[PDB]
Structure 1
Amino acid sequence: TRKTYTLTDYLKNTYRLKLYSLRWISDHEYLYKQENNILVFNAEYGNSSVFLENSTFDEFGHSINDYSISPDGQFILLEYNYVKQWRHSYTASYDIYDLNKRQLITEERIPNNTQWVTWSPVGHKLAYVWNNDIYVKIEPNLPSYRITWTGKEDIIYNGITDWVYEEEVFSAYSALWWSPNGTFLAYAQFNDTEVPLIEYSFYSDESLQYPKTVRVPYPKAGAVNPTVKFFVVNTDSLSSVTNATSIQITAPASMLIGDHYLCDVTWATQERISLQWLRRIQNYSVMDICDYDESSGRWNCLVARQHIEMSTTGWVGRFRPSEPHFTLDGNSFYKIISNEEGYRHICYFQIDKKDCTFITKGTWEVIGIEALTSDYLYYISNEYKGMPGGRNLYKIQLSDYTKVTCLSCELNPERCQYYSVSFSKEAKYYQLRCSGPGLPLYTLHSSVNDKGLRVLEDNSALDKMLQNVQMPSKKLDFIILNETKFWYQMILPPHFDKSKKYPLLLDVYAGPCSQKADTVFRLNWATYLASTENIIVASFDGRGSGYQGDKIMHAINRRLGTFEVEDQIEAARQFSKMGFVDNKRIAIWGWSYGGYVTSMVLGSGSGVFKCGIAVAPVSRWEYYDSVYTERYMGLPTPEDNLDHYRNSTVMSRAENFKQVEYLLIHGTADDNVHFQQSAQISKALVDVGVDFQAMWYTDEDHGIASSTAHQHIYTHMSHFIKQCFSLP
């Protein structure tokens, strides 16, 4: 008999998915790491050479965390002493290695505790952030030029984001943007002076006698937000003037009237920059297109070039307004926007004309614009077979919009329905990354003729290994609720027999624009639960879910904790109606937003669920951050949406937890969903006399991702689900 996919298989990563992570260095070459050696590959022929031998830094004296080769290939940035901060941020030490001289640079070194470092996009200039101020080095061995003097820990951030902008706006720590040829350095400045601090204990190693109090400027819903300013400095003037001026570009009057955000920065040309601003009430955004005026040395944003993007049914964008993709001359751009039917499609704009032209349309959505050449625009969409959970690459002819080719749809239609892509520098080549429903498959292609050059990684070693394992299967389908198709997936036990009654675990995210029903192949906890424990692990995309139009996505506008919660309960009732589910053994679990939904479901009094697990849940919207929460909820004021903020807490449903078995889990150093959130749930349960199971994770954050805590949490949850389902 074949073994199953066990909990230890998952926790020890016995069955490893092979990747093919390349780094394009030009229009025809990429870097790839093979046995710690950095190899340079010719895309056209597949032949390689050792770019940098694995032995090069044996006598360095520090474990190198990562590297970054300068665009001109003259230098290599070596990252070490990596200390993680939030989701994207960290600090590190850096050394620069001169590739020509084959020597490490020992003078004018990047300082220790550097927050961010980036090469210019051409050549080898560097911009870095140290002690919240920006510095620029024209040459790696030469002194830096200081750009800002206002940087102050927890107060003024120059060229780096504060907590909320990193997490919710930019999805990056960096707040600097070099112009295409590196002449200008644009940057944002955040002022957190009046932003309140979240404070929590950090216990550290057992040697630490007194716990440390971590204090982070974090605006919770309705609190004082950081303010922002935007500047542009001419780096070519640094060696000629004592103190080069940072020219401010002010937000438009329509934004200055109240609280707002800087939400996008995109250079159009060497002398033209676009900026998108978003009002704190996130249903109104403004794009400014600003040109360098050589005579005044100023940046001017013509009102004739200003573009408004607004929503009457919800917020702007999926999580924020989309980025524009400028044509080479910078006189026009493409941008994903919601059409009149509420479907996200590519619109083509002239910079000084307000009405745009849609180049795509249909009851499906464009996911992202991937590359733009003088003749073609390349994008990813879920158009294929009307499957919102699938992803394919398309090519549209710019001189004829009726000419749309699907580049990936038919490559391996059984194995591959979810693609991502990586284009070379001027889009001459593209790597396709298939992530499911079969094993991930990485292929290289030439853009000149769309021909498949070679298979880079097919995961054949893993396929051989899995043949000896009783693997679960995955069913992806839909149910029709009120004449609308709603997609679901099920991880089915091996030898799934529809005449048998199986226990069911509902795996929930269900946040706005979430998608849990897709074609991706995963080896995770659900793989184990279905394979070894014979549990069906189901997920459902209800109202509020993404990639299916605004009528679905905006259904939860101003009403989080309503339809998306009700639709999970309804999904479980629909799954019971299918005949292969034991109705006495239905459980629900989720993390973060999934934890909030799990808890809301468990407190609903539905009687559908026996048990559930909430990991790092939100419990009350006033505890979560301003940017994310207010996007869907508006402000927690009597004049706005306070009544709904108060009506959608987990705590108010405490009495209903008497009907279920609940497991509540949270990391004590969670800077994102504060431990406070679960501390308030537990107190409300204790207050009504509800028994439940709990687990805190000392010094773990939102990811509970340290090697030991990851194994501990999944082991603890596995025992809980098994006990709930009477499984030995």
Structure 2
Amino acid sequence: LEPFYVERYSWSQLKKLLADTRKYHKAPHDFMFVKRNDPDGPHSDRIYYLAMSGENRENTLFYSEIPKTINRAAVLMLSWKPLLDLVGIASYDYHQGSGTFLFQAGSGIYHVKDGGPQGFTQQPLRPNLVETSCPNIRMDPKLCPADPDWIAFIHSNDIWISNIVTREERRLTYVHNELANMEEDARSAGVATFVLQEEFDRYSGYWWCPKAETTPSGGKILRILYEENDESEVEIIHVTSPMLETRRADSFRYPKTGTANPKVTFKMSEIMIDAEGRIIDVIDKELIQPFEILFEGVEYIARAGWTPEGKYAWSILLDRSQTRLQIVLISPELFIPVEDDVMERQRLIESVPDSVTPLIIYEETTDIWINIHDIFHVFPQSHEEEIEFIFASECKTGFRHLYKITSILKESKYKRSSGGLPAPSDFKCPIKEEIAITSGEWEVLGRHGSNIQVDEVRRLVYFEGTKDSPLEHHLYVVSYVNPGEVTRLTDRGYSHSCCISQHCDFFISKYSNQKNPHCVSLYKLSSPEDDPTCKTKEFWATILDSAGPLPDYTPPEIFSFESTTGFTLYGMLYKPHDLQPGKKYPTVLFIYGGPQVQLVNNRFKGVKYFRLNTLASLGYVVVVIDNRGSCHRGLKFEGAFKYKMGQIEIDDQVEGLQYLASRYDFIDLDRVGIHGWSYGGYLSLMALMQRSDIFRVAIAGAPVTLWIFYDTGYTERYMGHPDQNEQGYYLGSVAMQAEKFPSEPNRLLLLHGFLDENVHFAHTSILLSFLVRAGKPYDLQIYPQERHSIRVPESGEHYELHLLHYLQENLGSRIAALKV
């Protein structure tokens, strides 16, 4: 069986090849339905959404008209109507009673009105700048749901509010100083700190109370819950400033694993507004006892918000190890004004009843980890001493499922005036009811936009899950009263990502598969008159048509194999284009292989993984395998590498590789390469360390080389604290095992964005430090202008060019074979 050697192009020629194939190459999202309520008009709804409409175009608001009826013989294509007059807009708020949109576009915060009592526009509206006296950029703007005249935003790590008709502007928090350096002033209000944004996907740190309390004089009280962080004890790291001329570095509060997270607490801003819409006074309030006493054991505020009527604030709270989750109701009466005078302050503590107390309405544990999600729905309060809610969890069965829970709002055993600390269980509510709404060997999805929509009239819950296949996401519906069978609403053969109307009579799906690029289509939901539980769908219109099967892109084929570990493991195979019979080709394993990611599924890969096809076209077999630890296969599948990251993943990659090599004799196992970014770079190094017999070259992008360098939230989920897993951290850190790398050159390539604040460059430089100490060869490429991703096209072009040339010169071509 003869070895195929790839065509040996020059650097200039490969640049041309890449530029030519690139030359040919954002979908609508954040949908919202608003009813017309016009009996004579032809339209039932107007949908609003964010999209581009061009390769080089700002992301902006559009609308389309949903007609009451359609021509069912034809296919309706909805025209995109620009909502606004002339990157861009990333998200938007809406208040339905008034029609007020609010959004940030560049530095400015703007608002328009459509769909309210004002009616529906037929032409682009003019964005109205919310004026300000704040010198710096305003971040994270939110409408007050109780009063759409008021917004809030962050300026220099403090909370501000601004009235968009009276033009009044007030600062609510005085925690940060814009003029002081960060080393001395490390406190913020209303802002999620690094670990929360990066490792829990919480981006805001303040929440409007959705209802206004009326006052005696005919005014009102608006309310804002917010987290206040003190990062004074968090370690300070320096990362190189993008302006390389300065030869300077930015300071950065980075809680590395096994060191202090920020000191956190809850606060409440109480804004008194008079009859004319003007601020009487602002009273800043704090918890009656400190956070550590009321919420024992809690490290992270994972999520937060309010109940629909604004009676209680809620929060989802994690312990340090992230094996215990608590859902806690927090009353506004737990908050007292911040007081310097101890005499007046002691009176305010004694004035608040002992009956007012935190209410832990739910608690769960696991000995794997808590995966945080966005599913949490709270029904209206039927009775004063009860609360009903839907939550999702992997803790019961090891797959994420929905549960309808009723908890009893009991007065606590603990009395505050007695002058003691509460026992752990004193705030725990008892569980009256806990019904499993779903179950099986498959999960409900709750991250990255996936959530539930609850029809309260027909008593149903729409959700996304993996019930039909782990390679496809689908829309499902089921009753939450008499949970029986689960009706799938999307068609098989594509993977779907869906949005359901607030009115529960429509859903939109963005869908694709390996062959076809992503589509976006609208579907009307119907039920037969005799049974509202039973749900059917009908195609209504196309929002975004697929480009169709692209020329010069051959998709891969999805394979599987029964692993010796007792799991089916899936993969993607790109056959090298124009197979010559009786010839064996060089192979390139592309890998990520860490938690919270699945690379192998029935989705279009011709956008993001286009260069895998380019490798196939030059004569490389390309393989991708989701090893144990990847998502969408349940908690036990995910848990396989708890305490043991780096030890198992390459066994699955090799087992899958050898499966393919037996069934396909065109795979040359003497010329295999491995490449990945972040965790993929990490495993690319482990592959070369552990299995140098199988892997000739390894190309590691932004690799974790040393787990002690990575943050608290991520590293302690999967590896625990470093003091209690000394062997796991050692075996999982490539920089502590530099002697295991080859003494042969032209096998190791390290790639790194120099400005990376996520996986610090330090990971690479310390690896290099030990490789140099151990007399080991390496190749290195730096991207001086890039962080963790590659954003500037020139850097990405150079990356791809160097990668192809490296694979050619050290793996694929005939000159590569001669170098040994």
Global fold match (TM > 0.5): yes
For residue 703 of structure 1, what is the aligned residue in structure 2? 789
Tell me what 2:206 maps to.
176
1:372 aligns with 2:450: no
CA distance 1:486–1:528, change in 2 (3 Å): closer
Structure 2 residue 381 is the aligned partner of structure 1 residue 326: no
CA contact (8 A) 1:592 1:617 kept: yes
Deviation (angstroms), 1:702: 0.3
Aligned partner of 1:262 among 290, 301, 310: 301
Do the aligned partners of residues 667 and 249 (structure 1) sit closer, same or farther apart at CA in structure 2, a change above 3 Å counting?
farther
2:558 and 2:572 in contact (8 A); partners too: yes
1: CA distance between counterparts of 2:692 and 2:364? 41
Aligned match of 1:390: 472
- SS of structure 1 residue aligned to 2:762: helix
Tell which deviates more after alignment, 251-260 or 504-513. 251-260
- Offset of 1:423 from its aligned partner? 2.2
Per the TM alignment, residue 479 of structure 1 is displaced from its structure 2 partner at its CA by: 3.0
Q: Which residue of 2 aligns with 1:452?
A: 539
Structure 2 residue 465 is matched with structure 1 residue 381: yes
Alignment of 1:168-247 (within 5 A): 168-169=199-200, 171-181=201-211, 183-204=222-243, 208=245, 210-235=246-271, 237=273, 239=278, 241-247=280-286
Deviation of 1:140 after TM superposition, in Å, equals 4.6
Report the CA distance shift for 1:497/1:293 in structure 2 as closer, same or farther (over 3 A): farther
Deviation at 1:442, TM superposition (A): 1.0
Tell me: CA distance 1:298–1:661, structure 2 relative to 1, closer, same or farther (3 Å): farther
Matched with 1:402 is 484
After TM superposition, give the deviation of residue 172 of structure 1 in Å: 4.2
Mapped partners of 1:308, 1:257: distance in 2: 13
Query: Secondary structure at 1:151's aligned position in 2?
Result: coil
1:262–1:278 contact (8 Å) kept in structure 2: yes
Partner of 1:316: 370
Higher mean displacement: 330-339 or 601-610: 330-339
Residue 269 of structure 1 aligns to a residue whose secondary structure is coil
2:725 is matched with: 641
1:306 counterpart SS class: strand
Q: Distance in 2 between matches of 1:294 and 1:426?
A: 36
Within 2, Cα distance between the matches of 1:424 and 1:430?
A: 6
- Residue pairs, 1:25-104, within 5 angstroms: 26=34, 28-32=45-49, 38-45=61-68, 56-57=85-86, 68=92, 70-72=94-96, 77=102, 79-80=104-105, 82=106, 92-96=107-111, 104=128
Cα-to-partner distance string for 1:111-165 (whole Å, 9 max, x where unaligned): 5411322223463421100011101123354212222111246411211112222
TM-score, normalising length: structure 1: 0.86
Which one is further off, 499-508 or 274-283?
Answer: 499-508
* Further displaced range: 41-50 or 487-496: 41-50
SS of match in other structure, 1:456: strand
Report SS of the residue matched to 1:351.
Answer: strand
Once the two structures are superposed, what CA deviation does each residue of 1:498-523 show, in whole Å capped at 9, x if it has no partner? Answer: 86533221111111243122111112
- Secondary structure at 1:599 match in 2: helix
| Preserved CA contact (<8 Å) 1:573 1:608 | no
Structure 1 residue 187 displacement after superposition: 1.4
CA contact (8 A) 1:343 1:363 kept: yes
1:156 aligns with 2:192: no
Q: Structure 1 pair 294/246, CA: closer, same or farther in 2 (3 Å)?
A: closer
Contact 1:322 1:335 in 2 (8 A): no
Cα distance between partner residues in 1 of 2:594 and 2:356: 37
| In structure 2, C-alpha distance between the alignment counterparts of 1:380 and 1:558, rounded to whole Å | 30
Post-superposition offset of 1:284 = 1.3
Question: Quick check: 1:348 aligned with 2:404?
Answer: yes
Q: Is the Cα–Cα contact under 8 Å of residues 266 and 324 in structure 1 kept in the other structure?
A: no
Bigger drift between 701-710 and 227-236 goes to 227-236
Aligned counterparts of 2:270 and 2:760: Cα–Cα separation in 1:
41
> Percent identity, aligned pairs only?
23
Kindly provide the amino acid, as one letter, of the partner of residue 192 in structure 1.
E
Distance 2:247 2:519 in 1: 48
CA distance in 2, matches of 1:140, 1:668: 46
Comparing 566-575 with 36-45, greater Cα deviation is found at 36-45
Give the equivalent residue in structure 1 for 2:670.
584
Q: Contact 2:364 / 2:395 at 8 angstroms: preserved in 1? A: no
- Separation in 2 of the partners of 1:669 and 1:250? 42
Asked if the contact 1:381–1:394 (Cα under 8 Å) also holds between the matched residues in 2, the reply is yes
Matched, 1:7 2:18: yes
Task: List runs of 5+ in structure 1 lacking aligned partners.
Answer: 58-62, 83-91
Q: Using the alignment, how far apart are the partners of 1:64 and 1:482 within structure 2? A: 48
What corresponds to 1:484 in structure 2?
567
User: Secondary structure at the residue paired with 2:498?
Assistant: strand
Looking at structure 1, the residues matched to 502 and 290 of structure 2 have their Cα atoms a distance apart, in angstroms, of 32
C-alpha distance in structure 2 between counterparts of 1:22 and 1:196, whole Å: 37
- Residue 769 (structure 2) aligned to one of 683, 705, 709: 683
- Greater alpha carbon shift after TM alignment, 643-652 vs 694-703: 643-652
> Taking structure 1 as reference, are residues 298 and 587 closer, same or farther at Cα in structure 2, changes over 3 Å only?
farther
Q: Does 1:692 align with 2:731?
A: no
Bigger radius of gyration among the two: 2
Q: In the alignment, what sits opposite 2:172?
A: 147
Shift of 1:257: 4.7
5+ long unaligned stretches in structure 2? 1-13, 36-44, 69-75, 119-124, 213-221, 336-350, 409-429, 528-536, 815-820
The separation in 2 between residues aligned to 1:482 and 1:105, in whole angstroms, is: 59
Contact 1:97 1:104 in 2 (8 A): yes
SS at match of 2:738: helix
